[PDB]
Amino acid sequence: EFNILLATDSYKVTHYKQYPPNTSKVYSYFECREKKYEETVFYGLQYILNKYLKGKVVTKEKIQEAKDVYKEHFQDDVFNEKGWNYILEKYDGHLPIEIKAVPEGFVIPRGNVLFTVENTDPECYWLTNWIETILVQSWYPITVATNSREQKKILAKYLLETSGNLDGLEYKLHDFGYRGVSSQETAGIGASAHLVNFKRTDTVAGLALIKKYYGTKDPVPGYSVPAAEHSTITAWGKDHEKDAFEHIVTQFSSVPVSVVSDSYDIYNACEKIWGEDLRHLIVSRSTQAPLIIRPDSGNPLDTVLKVLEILGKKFPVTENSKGYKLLPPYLRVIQGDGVDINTLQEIVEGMKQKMWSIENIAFGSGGGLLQKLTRDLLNCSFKCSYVVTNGLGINVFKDPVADPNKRSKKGRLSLHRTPAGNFVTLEEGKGDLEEYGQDLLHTVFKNGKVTKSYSFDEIRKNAQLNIEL
Amino acid sequence: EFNILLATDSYKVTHYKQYPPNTSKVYSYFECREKKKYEETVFYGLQYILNKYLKGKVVTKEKIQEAKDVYKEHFQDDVFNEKGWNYILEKYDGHLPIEIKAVPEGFVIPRGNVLFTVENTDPECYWLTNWIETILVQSWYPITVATNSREQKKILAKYLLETSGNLDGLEYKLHDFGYRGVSSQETAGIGASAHLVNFKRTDTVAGLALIKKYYGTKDPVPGYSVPAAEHSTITAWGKDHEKDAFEHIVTQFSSVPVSVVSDSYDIYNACEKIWGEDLRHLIVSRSTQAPLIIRPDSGNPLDTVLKVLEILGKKFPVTENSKGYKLLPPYLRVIQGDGVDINTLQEIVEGMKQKMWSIENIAFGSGGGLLQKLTRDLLNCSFKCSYVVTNGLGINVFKDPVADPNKRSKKGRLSLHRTPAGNFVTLEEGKGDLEEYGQDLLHTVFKNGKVTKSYSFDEIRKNAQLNIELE
């Protein structure tokens, strides 16, 4: 069972002894610090609040467990047993913490306050930063959602330019990341974050998380389609690749089906097997049930371009209203190898230069979508900005001489709309001067209760692209 | 509750309809594929997965119906092998009819070798071997963390040996700071445990419980920490009271090691004037078992470490050790815990050696670099089908993409052996059966729902030792 007393960085166990004597309040905030990625999608805090922070999170057993572990871990007795007991006895184990946050799905420029944390009981001054570690992990869903959305911007731009519209945009980036992430829990969180922007996923874990923690009007937030993997082709034997293809497309004759075509020779598969031997099984398919040819090796751009050129000569290609080449509607391509935001950009621009519509293509991304991301990408950071000691409030901050980029904000913070309709973060409690209207943060957690929440539908609406709006 | 029927890549739900008819066996294997450096990998983490997710009654009526309901909406189609899953439930009381054989955990194996294999034990369950690919492949993560951590240990060992003449304290020189920088609580536990294969310092507490539950140590705990400040415990005193914060903290922790972050405003002022003059009397009186550990946390990591040492070396009594390298007094040490990964670690210790500073003086903290900035393609961790039986005939299968020879996979039934020179070789096409290469190093670790062989965390550590530690 999860124990919040054991879910922090070890050194934080010793911090209650380090703050100034008679400190009654510790107030801290999270931002994606300013230094590509000029704006971030706020997503994921609600999951953390519900799964880990709400309700009775302290018991006698959990306190004893943490005491016993930390005694051995530090080779010394430094654990604040009394402080945790206070929370157990006074609040029935509910955390005396208040969290204010921007609404989930909101798209906010870097360097703005996204959420704040403060203790609601003076005895629990130490609790604010105890939970830094668990709250800071919000960096991951924020970062997946943001990087996913930046890829949606690229796709929308090139789809609009080559086809004249955005039809199918939300199906153009398919999460293949389940095997390439670091755990089952990460799989669910990361997939859910991708689904803020798109509707295609093979990472099943994301569905249950969304259903449990957020909710959608639709039965599921994300979809997949039948597809082969290398084993369902190669198992037929090296001389029987054609037999494999035929069986598979016949088994899935009236739904879309993706068939990995590079087990031995992608160019042969496209030109000779699909393009000649099995062509009669492709040209007979429904617009609602295309074959999706899937290359999976080689230089992604060169391979996509060559596959398209091959198919373009074996199948009837049309020219859309924008002047770009379009495969017949029973035939599409998916590139699911080596795709990240950079190579995605390179492929669509390369297609555009060769006059191929982005209609023709979809992308699968795994490690690039859900794993190859760190807290440094958006400088996701949690810092103390305000304390009260001896009944006096002090605005606090860091400002390292050798890195002004690491300077933190001072005092009590609030988020506001500017006269031009942008966001601004006011420091030093200046939000109280009421020169900038109401604070846009909302209380989302207070004294063990989740006080405000968002459906996955409203998160999606908040996260929409300008061009979509 | 966890449902194994919902723990695969979506497309795998459709694969039972795609294999050749009359297929009774699907046999697959995992390797860290060679790539035309990380030449050897630590095999670690499978036991966690076997116990947490694969063993026992993992199929129930309710889990089957749950999966059916989800996949109906997810695919907008009824494709789902309910009969296949029902069979496992009825015939095996929901235990997976799978055999997994694996190299012992902790083993250090060169790239391009079989590390584990997977096959179905019942012909009806040919589809199940690759169903569980997704969950098993996630073993890439503890493998890669353990491997990358160990490679950093090699660098530390080489430089510690060169600059000091021994390896004392080597296991305490890389401290896991990664808890907040990983993607989830579960990941934190797994990654932290992987680091602890090589080292003993961690703030990622989640790793301890995982190890205790799934592996076990003779010692009460596998990993340790020491009291340390963060910026909040310094800055809360106010900008003009950094010295008061330092004093309060070192006095609170006067008899144990304590790390104090010293760059809140001006790291160089802090070292030279605050530690080096104002509070010097509190530092020089400390025990060798309770040093002050000064922590810079910003600026160019190499440049800053060198300047911190230069400053401290002129405020404190420095000795020259038997190797000719400078050494701070035993009550004073430094930890660089910002921007550390395997590359910057190498650059720092090399820069230190150039400036004649012993590696004894320094320790490292690594967070994102240690537990998060790693992917499955770092070691090309990969799971492929190499053997099937169709119509009673075994056939050796593989992929071999024309444009990428590096993605070619192995053929047939596999086994891992010692070579005459003591190295490793993976035999293909069932050639291990010729018995020309002594015993298969793969052991059955899972069979029909039961974990059949387990390793303690102590055995794993012994297996993962550096050669230099052995010598």
Author numbering:
A (entry chain B): 8 to 42, 53 to 486
B (entry chain A): 8 to 43, 53 to 487
Paper text:
Unlike the G217A/V mutations, the G217R mutation caused more drastic reduction in the inhibitory potency for all compounds on our test panel. G217R causes His191 side chain to rotate to the same extent as G217V, while introducing additional changes to the structure of the NAMPT inhibitor-binding site. The R217 side chain competes for space with the bound inhibitor (e.g., with the terminal phenyl-trifluoromethyl group of GNE-618) in a similar fashion as H191R. Besides introducing steric clashes, the R217 guanidinium group also creates a basic patch at the surrounding protein surface that favors polar groups over hydrophobic groups. We conclude that these additional structural changes render the G217R mutation more deleterious for NAMPT inhibitor binding across structural classes. In contrast, NCI-H520 cells harboring the G217R mutant are similarly resistant to all 3 NAMPT inhibitors.
